[PDB]
Amino acid sequence: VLNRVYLNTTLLFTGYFPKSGANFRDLALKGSKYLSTLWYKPPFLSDFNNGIFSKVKNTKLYVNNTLYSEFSTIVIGSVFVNTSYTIVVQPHNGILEITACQYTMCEYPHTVCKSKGSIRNESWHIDSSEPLCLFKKNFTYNVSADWLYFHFYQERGVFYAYYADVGMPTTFLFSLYLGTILSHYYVMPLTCKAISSNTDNETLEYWVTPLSRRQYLLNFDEHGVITNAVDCSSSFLSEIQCKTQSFA
Amino acid sequence: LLQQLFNKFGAISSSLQEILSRLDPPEAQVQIDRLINGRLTALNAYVSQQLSDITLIKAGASRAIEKVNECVKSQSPRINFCGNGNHILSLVQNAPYGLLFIHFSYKPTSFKTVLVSPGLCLSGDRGIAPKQGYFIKQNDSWMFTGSSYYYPEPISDKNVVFMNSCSVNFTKAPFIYLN
Amino acid sequence: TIAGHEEFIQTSSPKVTIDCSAFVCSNYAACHDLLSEYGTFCDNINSILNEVNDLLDITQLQVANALMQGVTLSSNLNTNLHSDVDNIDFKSLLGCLGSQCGSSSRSLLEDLLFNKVKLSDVGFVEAYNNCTGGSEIRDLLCVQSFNGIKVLPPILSETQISGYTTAATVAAMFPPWSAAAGVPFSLNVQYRINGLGVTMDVLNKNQKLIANAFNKALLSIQNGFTATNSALAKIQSVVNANAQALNSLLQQLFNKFGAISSSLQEILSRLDPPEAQVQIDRLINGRLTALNAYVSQQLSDITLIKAGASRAIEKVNECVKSQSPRINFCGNGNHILSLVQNAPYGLLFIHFSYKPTSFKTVLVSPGLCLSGDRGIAPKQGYFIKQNDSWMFTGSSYYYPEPISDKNVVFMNSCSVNFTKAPFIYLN
Amino acid sequence: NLLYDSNGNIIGFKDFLTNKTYTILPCYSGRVSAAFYQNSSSPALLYRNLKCSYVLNNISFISQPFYFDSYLGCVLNAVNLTSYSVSSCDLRMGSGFCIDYALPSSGSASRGISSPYRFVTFEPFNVSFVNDSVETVGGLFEIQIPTNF
Amino acid sequence: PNTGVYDLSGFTVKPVATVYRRIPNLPDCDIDNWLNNVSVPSPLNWERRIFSNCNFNLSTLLRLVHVDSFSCNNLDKSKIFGSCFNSITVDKFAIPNRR
Ligand SMILES: *[C@@H]1O[C@H](CO)[C@@H](O[C@@H]2O[C@H](CO)[C@@H](O[C@H]3O[C@H](CO[C@H]4O[C@H](CO)[C@@H](O)[C@H](O[C@H]5O[C@H](CO)[C@@H](O)[C@H](O)[C@@H]5O)[C@@H]4O)[C@@H](O)[C@H](O[C@H]4O[C@H](CO)[C@@H](O)[C@H](O)[C@@H]4O)[C@@H]3O)[C@H](O)[C@H]2NC(C)=O)[C@H](O)[C@H]1NC(C)=O
Ligand SMILES: *[C@@H]1O[C@H](CO)[C@@H](O[C@@H]2O[C@H](CO)[C@@H](O)[C@H](O)[C@H]2NC(C)=O)[C@H](O)[C@H]1NC(C)=O
Ligand SMILES: *[C@@H]1O[C@H](CO)[C@@H](O[C@@H]2O[C@H](CO)[C@@H](O)[C@H](O)[C@H]2NC(C)=O)[C@H](O)[C@H]1NC(C)=O
Ligand SMILES: *[C@@H]1O[C@H](CO)[C@@H](O[C@@H]2O[C@H](CO)[C@@H](O)[C@H](O)[C@H]2NC(C)=O)[C@H](O)[C@H]1NC(C)=O
Ligand SMILES: *[C@@H]1O[C@H](CO)[C@@H](O)[C@H](O)[C@H]1NC(C)=O
Ligand SMILES: *[C@@H]1O[C@H](CO)[C@@H](O)[C@H](O)[C@H]1NC(C)=O
Ligand SMILES: *[C@@H]1O[C@H](CO)[C@@H](O)[C@H](O)[C@H]1NC(C)=O
Ligand SMILES: *[C@@H]1O[C@H](CO)[C@@H](O)[C@H](O)[C@H]1NC(C)=O
Ligand SMILES: *[C@@H]1O[C@H](CO)[C@@H](O)[C@H](O)[C@H]1NC(C)=O
Ligand SMILES: *[C@@H]1O[C@H](CO)[C@@H](O)[C@H](O)[C@H]1NC(C)=O
Ligand SMILES: *[C@@H]1O[C@H](CO)[C@@H](O)[C@H](O)[C@H]1NC(C)=O
Ligand SMILES: *[C@@H]1O[C@H](CO)[C@@H](O)[C@H](O)[C@H]1NC(C)=O
Ligand SMILES: *[C@@H]1O[C@H](CO)[C@@H](O)[C@H](O)[C@H]1NC(C)=O
Ligand SMILES: *[C@@H]1O[C@H](CO)[C@@H](O)[C@H](O)[C@H]1NC(C)=O
Ligand SMILES: *[C@@H]1O[C@H](CO)[C@@H](O)[C@H](O)[C@H]1NC(C)=O
Ligand SMILES: *[C@@H]1O[C@H](CO)[C@@H](O)[C@H](O)[C@H]1NC(C)=O
């Protein structure tokens, strides 16, 4: 919660949460030379209704015993043409670059690993005229983290983003007024020379589940850290736990 | 309960006469609804209090019926039920919203300090215990007295209960073969 | 042998008082001006709670009158010297009585009971004494008392009730014998066991075993208040029910009842006195409804408490102070006597009973037909055949003894299924 | 920067300017119990579970010449007389204490001023006492038996 | 009145002092500069500005713009004068005459 601390207690709280018992979908795509057009189809092009929760694997590469962080970039928009705004979240090896601009998006966008670059060039937009932007900001993350977590949602024309790189519960990253409704998101395929099984056996992973407004019971420990949660409408035991406000 | 008719309950007045002589039927109903809700709440509270008081009244009535059956109509062998101990009998009279019981009891007025024994061991290792009384020594002879009035009288079979053995702290008395 | 078991009876409850305008409006001047226009609403709540607490005081005086009615003691009695009669130790039941004691103590059984219940009458006082400071940082009782909800002490302290139960216990041990029917304690035990159908020869031979069984039963009661005792759970249920009711009443101050907020501070810092009164009126109506519901529930619980107190007074009069000829009233049958101890919000009764341990299969007759067509029936026993001779035995202990006039009831005729016995002209 | 409980109240904060941390407690609130006897000019007062130093420093600053601390709290306008005992009382304060009223008569005209209220011990029941022995006098017991009724 | 024990009305300990904390040296919000801007949008493309971490007051604002009317809803004008907020959002557009 916003600027509050809760200490050694349970709390009943309604927020933009995932549904317990639903499914994640691993929408990450790795390529080497060819790009399939079926990758850019409404199996993978999905609906942004209220928002998404994502669990992202931080893939670590080593060149001359030096660490490189890599994961997929995500785009959120409506029609992906230069008469609308798209939000792009892209990593740059410890720097998370977040932009919201009127990009001229390509038909088949992809990104390229920078540590050991691939055959293709990075091409997700072509804009030789510096388009209009509402938001342009760089943040930092832990390069030695195993997982990253993101909340993205919208309400009354405002976009909200939360993230975490140490531990599971996320903290507020930014908000941005748009005045319009976002409708689609897409996880962009990453083209790399060496990630597969004949190489060092690394994988890309980007798990996405939808968000909705619902009530949870949260447990805060002595230091104020969220340690346990229960979705109140997921099972019978969860209904008992939320009517007693107790985890046992 | 009658004082509740002068509360306003958030309305402009507690009087329906003053409301209905100032306002229109659209505007008067908003004021009358508050008085209606307040007075219905007061009646509900009174009704709940009466329903709670009737249970105490029924418990008292069952106790009075028990005292009529077992202290006035007969005399039970229960001690300390009617009166206080040393209770003799009771009479009953009608009273406003109930009954008036008159209890009569035995009351001692003067006393005497006596040395008593709770039982005697007779020859043949037999024992006698006194029945609602004590064994006393008068002129170095064992006699009986009742426990509520001092009156020495001879030990007989109507005063004692016989035992084929005797207790370990009964007083020895081998001279007794009395009436 | 002799078995003992304890039983708790509730006679009182915590006396809750409520400041109605402090619960509804707290501090705020604006809320108080509004509350007045509701007139006589808080006065009825205060009146009903005062009537409930007066009923509690009346029942406590009735219990204390039943404990002390008609007991005469010796002025030379001193519990430091006089705590044992007929090889039975009463030390764990007696408080401190005499002319050199100073009556501010309990017995050690009452000390064992009162140390496992934190919120007794003295626990509430020492908890409210710490509200200026908090004594950790905070407590639920101080938050309740700052919103006008407080538990008051009873009119009699618990050491006074312990002195009353000590007087009632010592009235059965010592040569007035006001509580033991004018006879010594061991003789009274012997006559009560004989009334069940046990001959007096066995009771005269086994007095020391009876005293040892009494000591063992008292020691077994003393080491039994450990986490599964029914009386301890029944005592703790009273405190837990009171704490739950007060916490649920305190939780009503965070309901919105249809208003924009449950806080008067947030309403009065945002709105004007025309617009604020519409919001404050909803909170006032919701909180008055909650207080009415609590007051109705308390008025219903006091009737159950009074019924339990009248039952405890009946057991004090007819099981401890005397022994009634009623069967199955105290205890379970084969009941001998009862003792009483003070308990948090009530009384603890200790019942002693006769318990058979081994048995024997006997062939019995319920009556004999003697010559001249006369009949005899046994008095609380049976007729048995030993060496082809008719003898008597008591119904609760096997001990054959000769048939005499003290064992039988004579009838001028005899029943149709009585056993024929023409050889009997015995003692 | 703000510490909350589960009901939504702020119970602590961190200061922006000094980086110091504090907890917040509510101020004291309570009521007074007035024991009043009819036709008297003022009642006796009881502040329950409060020391008299707190009452004189933090609550009331009017002149109160008579005060003492008792087991129930701070008592104003009464005399401490708990060694005295009474068997009936109409001003019962709890835990075996009572407030008695005794005006100074014409014969007992008190020149030194004091209060007509007295804080005493309430004891409604007693046992009867006899002057007999508790043990055997030569194997016999000593008892009192009535001779008239 | 009769002889009895009476529980009187509840008191509260009166506060001795006042603790007052504010952040110093914050810039001005300058809401009048945005309201008096030359470019005025239509209701079809109405504009929004968010103001936070700044100081404002209503007196200079209501005297520096030419006020025709100023009303408030779920709030009161006199309660704004010493208060702090998380943010203030200001939307503006020009009015067509018949609407
Ligand atoms: C915001 O986004 C929009 C996209 O929605 C951007 O608009 C796009 O701008 C592109 C320019 O960079 C433009 O690409 C092509 O446009 C040129 C004009 O084509 C017309 O004129 C031709 C005259 O020679 C004509 O041949 C052509 O007809 C072809 O296409 C139609 C289908 O459209 C077929 O039916 C015909 O049979 C024929 O094949 C059009 O009528 C075009 O000439 C360019 O192609 C040449 O150049 C290429 C690179 O040099 C080369 O590879 C190619 O072979 C040709 O030689 C050019 O590729 C998009 O058409 C246009 N899209 C829309 C929807 O308007 C907009 O620029 C952007 N804004 C900003 C500020 O970035
Ligand atoms: C966010 O970080 C990225 C990467 O560190 C910055 O992109 C670099 O910008 C400089 C200056 O324009 C270029 O010389 C580099 O070639 C860019 N690197 C890459 C990988 O694109 C970006 O400018 C930063 N954004 C902000 C707002 O500071
Ligand atoms: C209170 O703590 C904050 C840290 O949160 C201090 O702010 C830092 O101040 C130094 C020098 O003024 C800067 O170099 C840091 O970048 C600041 N940190 C942040 C997170 O802004 C602040 O100075 C402290 N105040 C006092 C009085 O000690
Ligand atoms: C009124 O608003 C306009 C925006 O519509 C302001 O114009 C901006 O001015 C700055 C510097 O003069 C430029 O960098 C921006 O590009 C301008 N905005 C646009 C959309 O062109 C203008 O400054 C405002 N007026 C005042 C007095 O502040
Ligand atoms: C944990 O929470 C409980 C409340 O249930 C509290 O009593 C306890 O003090 C807390 N623990 C610590 C270490 O503060
Ligand atoms: C790794 O080391 C080799 C030789 O030491 C060098 O040619 C190469 O450029 C290094 N890699 C990077 C990413 O600098
Ligand atoms: C990538 O870009 C470079 C520089 O423009 C170019 O030389 C190279 O051919 C490009 N790669 C491909 C696969 O077109
Ligand atoms: C986060 O970074 C710190 C140092 O920057 C490091 O000590 C820590 O291990 C990192 N977290 C994880 C999960 O590796
Ligand atoms: C990667 O996996 C293959 C499995 O065929 C294995 O042979 C190889 O040793 C693995 N390499 C590493 C670096 O784990
Ligand atoms: C019998 O009397 C003696 C002395 O009076 C006493 O020590 C003993 O305990 C008594 N025994 C019983 C069973 O009363
Ligand atoms: C009251 O406070 C004292 C000292 O602060 C402490 O020893 C005692 O246990 C407290 N009592 C209660 C009931 O909290
Ligand atoms: C004292 O009180 C009684 C109330 O019964 C009243 O009748 C009497 O007048 C009072 N005395 C004086 C002097 O007012
Ligand atoms: C009140 O008097 C009693 C003796 O009657 C004494 O023990 C007690 O300490 C006194 N209290 C105060 C506060 O002086
Ligand atoms: C015992 O209480 C009665 C109550 O009327 C009283 O008369 C008597 O003086 C008291 N006796 C002692 C010794 O306190
Ligand atoms: C009565 O008790 C007193 C104790 O003060 C004693 O001195 C006196 O001898 C006793 N009298 C009798 C007859 O026992
Ligand atoms: C009993 O008392 C009455 C009146 O007090 C008296 O007339 C009578 O003689 C007394 N009887 C005896 C036996 O003392």
Author numbering:
A (entry chain B): 51 to 298
B (entry chain A): 1043 to 1221
C (entry chain B): 795 to 1221
D (entry chain A): 646 to 794
E (entry chain A): 299 to 397
Excerpt from the publication:
The spike (S) protein of HKU1 plays a crucial role in cell invasion by binding to host receptors, with the transmembrane serine protease TMPRSS2 recently identified as its protein receptor. The S protein of HKU1-B forms a trimeric structure, with each protomer featuring a furin cleavage site “RRKRR”, akin to SARS-CoV-2. S1 comprises four domains: N-terminal lectin-like domain (NTD), RBD, subdomain 1 (SD1), and subdomain 2 (SD2).
To unravel the mechanism underlying the interaction between the S protein of HKU1-B and the host cell receptor TMPRSS2, we elucidated the cryo-EM structures of the HKU1-B S protein incubated with TMPRSS2 in various conformations, including a closed conformation, two 1up conformations (designated as 1up-1 and 1up-2), two 2up conformations (with or without TMPRSS2 bound, referred to as 2up-TMR and 2up-1), and a 3up conformation with TMPRSS2 bound (referred to as 3up-TMR).
